[PDB]
A paper describes a structure:
The cap open reading frame encodes three viral proteins (VP), VP1, VP2, and VP3, that form the capsid shell. The AAV capsid is comprised of a total of 60 VP monomers. All AAV capsids exhibit T = 1 icosahedral symmetry, but only the shared C-terminal VP3 region has been resolved, while the extended N-termini of VP1 and VP2 are intrinsically disordered.
For AAVpo.1 and AAVpo.6 capsid structures were generated from 512,823 and 539,729 particles, resulting in final maps with resolutions of 1.79 and 1.77 Å, respectively. On the other hand, AAVpo.6 is more similar to AAV9, with 98% aligned residues; however, significant differences such as in VR-IV, where AAVpo.6 has a 7-amino-acid deletion, resulted in an overall Cα-RMSD of >1 Å. The two porcine AAVs show little similarity in the surface loop structure and are as different to each other as AAV5 is to other AAVs that have been isolated from human tissues. The AAVpo.6 demonstrated an even larger preference for galactose binding, roughly 3-fold higher in Lec-2 as opposed to Pro-5 cells. AAVpo.6 shares four of these residues except for N470, which is substituted to serine (S460), whereas only N272 and Y446 are conserved in AAVpo. In contrast, AAVpo.6 shares many amino acids around the 2-fold depression.
Residue numbers in the entry:
A (entry chain c), B (entry chain A), C (entry chain S): 217 to 726
D (entry chain x): 669 to 726
Write the structure that this text describes.
């Protein structure tokens, strides 16, 4: 807070591996425009929109900071160290700092732009630590810290939605004025710091099972229990054993599922019509349909079917050059959840078969497929994996009830997540008239701000204690020659993340 | 316990609002007849009854006290204070007192009844604090303390059911003799007091969400994730944004549902046949069908459909003059759960759509409706609201397993609820014969008793901390003129509750 | 509180004169029926009523005690002692007691009534010490303690009014349940006691002025000030003196007035038409007209006009045998306020004359009468007198503003007056049915109660310090023979108050 | 510029049985939300709000 000629912070970007902990530190340079020309605005969908797409809400003049992706905090090498050596990890605490604030004024003049420092201007910042504002982190929006530390990013604009009926609003709809919160005001000498402790959450499981739920028995020994092995010409009963594993009695059940449509990576194997919407699995809420994407954690495909993926059931990331609209398959990266096929149903199949009738002398036994199956006692399952470029946490909705609140896009469910950090350039009016006018001032000096931001996160690690004799699968770079090195810049300075990297490499018994 | 000419208690009827607590106190005058002419009786259904309606059980000579409705403890104004100002509440402890006991004897004589005090007669009372008797509170029976403190009420008779097979009993059926418990005996000078502490339970949610589960995103910013936006003439992938909210990836799912039939308040929109039973949703247990009423918490109707309600899915109260059998629509009050449509499916619709097949070059993608959906990981929901005239608590059945034991009629699930309080007039034999007869005595003096009863409950309150700028919805009386004042007596002294009042007025973000 | 055979209080009826204080004690026997057959009832005016007479309210089963008249506490001799010897008095504190409670049950049988003691029955009593109920004392209602201590009285029924629009009610109308208050319950052995301290109030003025406001000057000496004594043929100015007192300059003004119509006690001097309503002075409030009775304190008549009285401007009491409706003049007693004619305008005249125009060479000077005149700086006045049979106190309405809140019927204005004391017989149900019926009980044993009540009031006195040489006027009995003695019983035991007795006998200078 | 004001409150102690009149937003749908900004950022106060809702005896 000293003054104009003194830096208010240093560049901290590092990773420190200590025993059962790893501390990441990330610093970036940011730029904040004036949004909405300083105004709050009501926003809503157009009259012609599909009912599924209607909304009502507000856009605000404020921006906000989003570090909610793993590559904000972990270099690719660090991620490798994590996933090859640890069975699990979770966040413990964080520190946040905003510093080296610079406010600039822009003047159009006659033909060219002119930029100068406005030494007396201020930026406002506050953390919503009581969770009093709509929480828009955790929706997988753009605008995070860029993965490559040398890139400079634009702070995204804050807006929110409230109750809508069509394009209109309801009496219970809420409007929030962010100036109705206390906030710190910073001139170029000032800085802002915030610290937070994560609530206890279970370790993410970074491991794959080396056994499947249906093969947990001793293959050498028969069961003492009997099953009905013969109906023809009278009932008969047998003890199951190594030659009939499908018949053995078991203690547990695979996890729940909600079946999705199956898409082929081979173009000629797909229907040529338009099923993009009609093929998706959807939930129906207050008259509106929403795709269930990614939906319950389910394995992407069964053995030797790797060409298939569920229509709305996997996270999909773009390659560096991918278009925003209608990018082709070769321009995207499709995640693969196959490692959980040991406990979880495959996303594109049935849960199983249920009996539908009463068999008798004249009536055959009938079954039908169960394509959607909720929780049953004795079920076990794995949650979806997390990815280097994927999200970290989400806010658990505040409700009477929830079940297993692991956010379905992956990551850590938190009742009290890292708070939203809001920032805004304080408006500076231009010269007012010399006769009093009661109207609110509409004329402002054009400004923007820039600075540095840092976030430090301490992560707890769960070590591997395996007695496995043979070597593990490990994430590795290719050792062969190539034109570029993976996860680097090219000749034009563009950083790119060529592939997605999950966490499940090491193994564990069921 | 002093004697004949000294009152054994005072009239305590009050409400005290202290900070984060509210203490209600309620006193009423009661009258207790002799039930069953002092006998225990086996009771069962008739041979001609429908199998769904068979039962076996016992009626007892005892009566019992029931204060298990909110209007026993809260005046309408008090309820208003509660719901307009608080996000939640729960019970903490209670005190119970029985006092000013009066026992009367009735003599028929020749032409007219004569009533006199029997100063030496006693009444017996005990609280089943070990939960050793069938617990019949929590079935929404009549016989509670009346809502208006000046009304005098009859104590209801205690009876219970046990295992039946048709109209018969099973070896494991239980018979309970209430005289096989210790009980206090009270003459006109004596009184009885009991105190109880509620177990920790979560706050009832008295609030509505100001956001819906499908609109939790920032409307200004696109997602970094991709979805499959085009199948026709090849696959294509897009990032979802403000113009396609139905396609965005999300972390959570709406709550479970079991779909019910839809009834219209407009008479001409209903089928004219008899579907009253065949239209209901039912569960099948040991060969018997029971309606699932009200069933899982589900919103009553979607936007602009307020004329519809689920057939068996809402609490329905009678107006003061409503008949017991076949009252018309205008004589009943139908509750409305619309506020939970933000997180819970509408009761009369599907949960969603699930994929049923494998699409290919020659085969279109198929889906079907899911009309019943159990719990999935990542679901969130609200429980049913409570009402001024609705129930307060229920006993959680003693079982190996249960899930989210919020009683489906609404209110607080308790493993150890407020105990049943049983009361009986001690039999007084008439003059026996002057020669010994071993038969049990069948001739008794006709008696009844009357007294006062008080219950005090301490409730804990959860305050509202909202940053909402615009005013809330609030429960209000109508300000216009009217012939009567709502929630008062009429010119004949009849008290009436004109409308139902829920708890959900204030709002909160998800 | 001992029991059946022990009295719970003694008969205290006395007056003790100590120095500058007088303590009155009054005991009476009361009887309380069941009112409204135990019910609360909405009550309102009929459709055909005049708009001025519409109302809406409730009648309650409760009774209440009213001691708000002076003859409840002062014997006629005591009142004489007070008014002949003291310049003022005010209440200081009181004690109240209810005791020797007896509850009786009445049985109709075949041909004659039978009355018996119900030893276990209770009566309920409470004092509204927080002023939470409509306060109906101070409206000059019947039902007070009788003036003669041997008379036994019926406790009056409590009811109240709330906002009405015509015969209907408004949303802001209030309904009060008196069972929603704590109250003490008394059996025949129990008693109830209450104590209260009056707030500081000014002494009532029991004295008449021996000077008039317009004669306060020294009759022997001229003024140094001049007045305009001559306009004809030029202005001229004179100093006023003993021969022109009407012209002297003065410091003060007579009190306010609102002129009323003049009625003659001589029948032939009155108009023979119907002016009973059209002749009254009235205020207009929310479309309703109310007579202004008695209205502002004004002298009843001027000197030698004692046959006249203001139409609605004096308290009027009935003689013992007076009818309730259309009693003739000889059957009523009309109070006379003539003693305040020294400072207050006469009720049937104008306040004075005000100038209405601008006089000049061609225009004469004009004045007009002022028949209604509000307060002006420099005004002085006396409040209305109090009477042996008149009211004592009134509750000052709770409002933003008031001016000189001496209640216009006379007596002491109190922000926190003696609280209402409410009493009710607890209902005792008759024998209920032997099968449970949820309807409220409609069948009760017929009962009433009786007991004694005592009130003790301490009064502070202001002594007379006059230097007057000649004897005072004094209130006196007539010394001559008569058939009856004033303020006694007649040969049939009827007590009667033959005349009204004010307080203003002794004199004081202005 | 900032201004902070401390206000003292007088609580309600009524024994009224029936519910009070209360100031409330309308619960129905509408194009705009009362006491908010519109699509152009203009804040507006649609109606006046007095203080007299709760009741008291004279």
């Amino acid at each position: 807070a000293d003054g104009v000629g003194n830096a208010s912070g240093n560049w901290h970007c590092d990773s420190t591996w200590l025993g059962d902990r790893v501390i990441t530190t990330s610093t970036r340079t940011w730029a904040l425009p004036t949004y909405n020309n300083h105004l709050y605005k009501q926003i809503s969908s157009q009259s012609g929109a599909n009912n599924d797409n209607h909304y009502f809400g507000y856009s605000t003049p404020w921006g906000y900071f989003d570090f909610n992706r793993f590559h904000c905090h972990f270099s690719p090498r660090d991620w490798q160290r994590l996933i090859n050596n640890n069975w699990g990890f979770r966040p413990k605490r964080l520190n946040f700092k905003l510093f080296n604030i610079q406010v600039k004024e822009v003047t159009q003049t006659d033909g060219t732009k002119t930029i100068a420092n406005n030494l007396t201007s201020t930026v406002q910042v506050f953390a919503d630590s009581e969770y009093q504002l709509p929480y828009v982190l955790g929706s997988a929006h753009q605008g995070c810290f860029p993965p490559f530390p040398a890139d400079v990013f634009m702070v995204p604009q804050y807006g929110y939605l409230t109750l809508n009926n069509g394009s209109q609003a309801m009496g219970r709809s809420s409007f929030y004025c962010l100036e109705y919160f206390p906030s710190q005001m910073l001139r170029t000498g000032n800085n802002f710091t915030f610290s937070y402790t994560f609530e206890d959450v279970p370790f993410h499981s970074s491991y794959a099972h080396s056994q499947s739920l249906d093969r947990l028995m001793n293959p050498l020994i028969d069961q003492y229990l009997y099953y009905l092995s013969k109906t023809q010409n009278g009932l008969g009963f047998s003890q199951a054993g190594h030659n009939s594993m499908r018949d053995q009695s078991r203690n547990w059940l695979p996890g729940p599922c909600f079946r999705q449509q199956r898409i082929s990576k081979t173009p000629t194997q797909n229907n040529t019509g338009d099923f993009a919407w009609t093929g998706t699995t959807r939930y129906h809420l207050n008259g509106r349909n929403s795709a269930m994407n990614p939906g319950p954690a389910m394995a992407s495909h069964k053995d030797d079917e790797e060409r298939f993926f569920p229509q709305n059931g996997v996270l999909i990331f773009g390659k560096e050059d991918a278009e925003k609209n209608n990018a082709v398959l070769d321009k995207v990266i499709i995640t693969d959840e196959e490692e959980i096929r040991t406990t979880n149903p495959v996303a594109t199949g049935e849960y199983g078969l249920v009996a539908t009738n009463f068999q008798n002398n004249t009536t055959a036994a009938d079954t039908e497929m169960v394509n959607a199956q909720g929780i049953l006692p004795g079920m076990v399952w794995q949650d979806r994996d997390v990815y280097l470029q994927g999200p970290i946490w989400a806010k658990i909705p505040h409700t009477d009830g929830h079940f297993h609140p692991s956010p379905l896009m992956g990551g850590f469910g938190l009742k009290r997540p890292p708070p939203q950090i809001l920032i805004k350039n304080t408006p500076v009016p231009a010269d007012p008239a010399t006769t009093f006018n009661p109207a609110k001032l509409a004329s402002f000096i054009t400004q923007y701000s820039t600075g540095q931001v840092s976030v430090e996160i301490e992560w707890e690690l769960q070590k591997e204690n395996s007695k496995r004799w043979n070597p593990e699968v490990q994430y590795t770079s290719n050792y062969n020659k190539s034109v570029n090195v993976e996860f680097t810049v090219d000749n034009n300075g563009v950083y790119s993340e060529p592939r997605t990297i999950g966490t499940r490499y090491l193994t564990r018994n069921l």
